[PDB]
C-alpha cells in the first residue's frame, strides 16, 4: 500500500549501478508530470508517486481522466469568468 | 492561420491508419513489482519540484 509523505520528503531532502539504471526513464517522468498539471479552478491536487529508494527519479502514475461534458462546461465557465475579469480589471507575471 | 490549422487537420485525417494489435502495455505495473520502487501520495507542486531537481 501507500506510504506517508514525510519519508520521501526526507529522501529528497537529505540527498552506483542501482542509482544509474533508474535515470534512463527521465523524460517519461517529465511526461507524467506535465500531463497532470492541475486545472485553474483547483487549489491543490494530491496524486500518487512512485519513487526510487535513493530518490533518483519520481513518477506520477495517474492518467488524467475526465467526463467530457463536465470538462467542457468547466472550461466554458473559465472562459466566461476570464472575459468578466478582463472587462472589469493587466500585469503579466515576470518570467523566470 | 485558419487555413494552416485546417491543413494540419486534413493531413492528420488523411494519414490516419488503424493501430496494430499488440499485447497491452504497462510500464508502471512492472515498476511496482520491483522492490527498488515505493508508492506514496504527494502534492503536485512537491513532486514537480522533485522531478526538476532530480533532472538537474
Amino acid at each position: 500500500e501507500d506510504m506517508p509523505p514525510e519519508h520521501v520528503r526526507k529522501i529528497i531532502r537529505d540527498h552506483k549501478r542501482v542509482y544509474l539504471g533508474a535515470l534512463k526513464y527521465m523524460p517519461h517522468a517529465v511526461l507524467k508530470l506535465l500531463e497532470n498539471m492541475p486545472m485553474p479552478w483547483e487549489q491543490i491536487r494530491d496524486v500518487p508517486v512512485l519513487y526510487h529508494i535513493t530518490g533518483a527519479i519520481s513518477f506520477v502514475n495517474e492518467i488524467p481522466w475526465v467526463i467530457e461534458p463536465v470538462y467542457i462546461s468547466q472550461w466554458g465557465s473559465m472562459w466566461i469568468m476570464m472575459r468578466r475579469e478582463k472587462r472589469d480589471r493587466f500585469k503579466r507575471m515576470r518570467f523566470p | 492561420s485558419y487555413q494552416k490549422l485546417l491543413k494540419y487537420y486534413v493531413l492528420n485525417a488523411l494519414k490516419h491508419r488503424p493501430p496494430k494489435a499488440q499485447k497491452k502495455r504497462y510500464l508502471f505495473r512492472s515498476f511496482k513489482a520491483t522492490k527498488f520502487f515505493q508508492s506514496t501520495k504527494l502534492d503536485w507542486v512537491e513532486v514537480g519540484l522533485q522531478v526538476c531537481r532530480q533532472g538537474y
Binding site: 549501478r17 | 499488440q22 499485447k23 510500464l27 520491483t34
Partner: peptide, 23 residues
C-alpha cells in the same frame, strides 16, 4: 550484480510486447 539483472529482466519484459513478432 542483482540490480542490473533486475533492470535487464524489466528490459526483456518490455521487449516481450513485440518479441515473437520482431525477431
Amino acid at each position: 550484480e542483482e540490480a542490473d539483472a533486475i533492470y535487464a529482466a524489466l528490459d526483456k519484459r518490455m521487449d516481450e510486447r513485440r518479441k515473437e513478432r520482431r525477431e
